[PDB]
Ligand binder design. Structure first.
Ligand SMILES: CC#Cc1cncc(-c2ccc3c(c2)[C@@]2(COC(N)=N2)c2cc(C4=CCOCC4)ncc2O3)c1
Length: 370
């Protein structure tokens, strides 16, 4: 899979994108990689933020589905016109498939001023596709029309340019150390998982585990932060505050209202605690844990940083803060997600991100919200 290594680019806070082509002859576009949605949607009009856009009038293979799609989401919206066309990934498998493409014709707070991407590749499942589950997601078409195995993995590396790898149809063993540990995909809509225990510097938060997954937990390459349900965010911050009490920061810092800065090269990593999420394992009463560093949850912006853990009303979102520590395998074929220590995660000489197990955890099914 050497061809696919380093096929992801981005800027901090603006997501990870992959090069794709659409139409005949192929039109090159950079596309945001998003495991937290299920539509392939591309700029199709000359929005001033866009480097380029899909021009259907130049594609001999374009087919108009004669249907609109209207996709408001939490932080923005896009609307467009559904069709199909030939789609390939130059630094992906050597294949081309006919996929659904939403040609974006109106939008608000969707495109980022200064970004280098023009569209969005929703890698999650048909259940949450717009307008409905009859609109086959890209990855489903890829697997259905080719021999590409039904899995992909992401290595997101971070720093200001970021980079990473999207391995389509496989696992590249050079991208991780130690073993992969798998947690079940609870339901095929989002990439939903179940967190069964939370530790700050090894100290259990001692919350009812349902709270950790209220109303769901998801693995989301399209979110920068680790987002936590309100009640869990309260406890997490209280514990991280206590752990980091050597140095006092404004209350706003913890809420993402302001940045904290240190002299270039003297960030006190060691006063900040590690954060461990235990995930439901593959076997009854068995779990594993993934552990991230402040290198992951304190994000560059003197060296100044943003606290990149935040409260949610939509459940836990394991965003880039989690994923940048790990090689993450979206094993759709076996309805499971693998975690392993990432060969590229940022760390120091004292601590590294970790994936460890097995542990004994009882009543893990009670942790899921219904
Ligand atoms: C890592 C990272 C990142 C990142 C940084 N800046 C902006 C984005 C971004 C841009 C457009 C965008 C989305 C994110 C976003 C929001 O969260 C996720 N997972 N995808 C998104 C989600 C949706 C959805 C439509 C229907 O429900 C599911 C999600 N539609 C459009 C979207 O556009 C991602």
């Amino acid at each position: 899979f050497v061809e696919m290594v380093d096929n992801l680019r981005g800027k901090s806070g603006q997501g990870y994108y992959v090069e794709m082509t659409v139409g005949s002859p192929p039109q090159t576009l950079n596309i945001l990689v998003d495991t937290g949605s299920s539509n392939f949607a591309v700029g199709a009009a000359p929005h001033p933020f866009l480097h380029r856009y899909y021009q259907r009038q130049l594609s001999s293979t374009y087919r108009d589905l004669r249907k609109g799609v209207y996709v408001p989401y939490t932080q923005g919206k896009w609307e467009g016109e559904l069709g199909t066309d030939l789609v390939s990934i130059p630094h992906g498998p050597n294949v081309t498939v006919r996929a659904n493409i939403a040609a974006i014709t109106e939008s608000d707070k969707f495109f980022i001023n200064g970004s280098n991407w023009e569209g969005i590749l929703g890698l999650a499942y048909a259940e949450i596709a717009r307008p409905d589950d009859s609109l086959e997601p890209f990855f489903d078409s890829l697997v259905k029309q080719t021999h590409v195995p039904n899995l992909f993995s992401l290595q997101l590396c971070g720093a200001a340019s970021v980079g990473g790898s999207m391995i389509i149809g496989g696992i590249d063993h050079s991208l991780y150390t130690g073993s992969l540990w798998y947690t079940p995909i609870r339901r095929e809509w989002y990439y939903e998982v179940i967190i069964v225990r939370v530790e700050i510097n090894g100290q259990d938060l001692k919350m009812d585990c349902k709270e950790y997954n209220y109303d769901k937990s998801i693995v989301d390459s399209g979110t920068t932060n680790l987002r936590l349900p309100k009640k869990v965010f309260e406890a997490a911050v209280k514990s991280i505050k206590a752990a980091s009490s050597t140095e006092k920061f404004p209350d706003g810092f913890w809420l993402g209202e302001q940045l904290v800065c240190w002299q270039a090269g003297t960030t006190p990593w060691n006063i900040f605690p590690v954060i461990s999420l235990y995930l439901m394992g593959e076997v009854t009463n068995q779990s594993f844990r993934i552990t991230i560093l402040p290198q992951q949850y304190l994000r560059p912006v003197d060296d100044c940083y943003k606290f990149a853990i935040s409260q949610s009303s939509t459940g836990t979102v394991m965003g880039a803060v989690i994923m940048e520590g790990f090689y993450v395998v979206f094993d759709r074929a076996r309805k499971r997600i693998g975690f392993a220590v990432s060969a590229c995660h940022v760390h120091d000489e004292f601590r590294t991100a970790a994936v460890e197990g097995p542990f004994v955890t009882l009543d893990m099914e009670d942790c899921g919200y219904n």
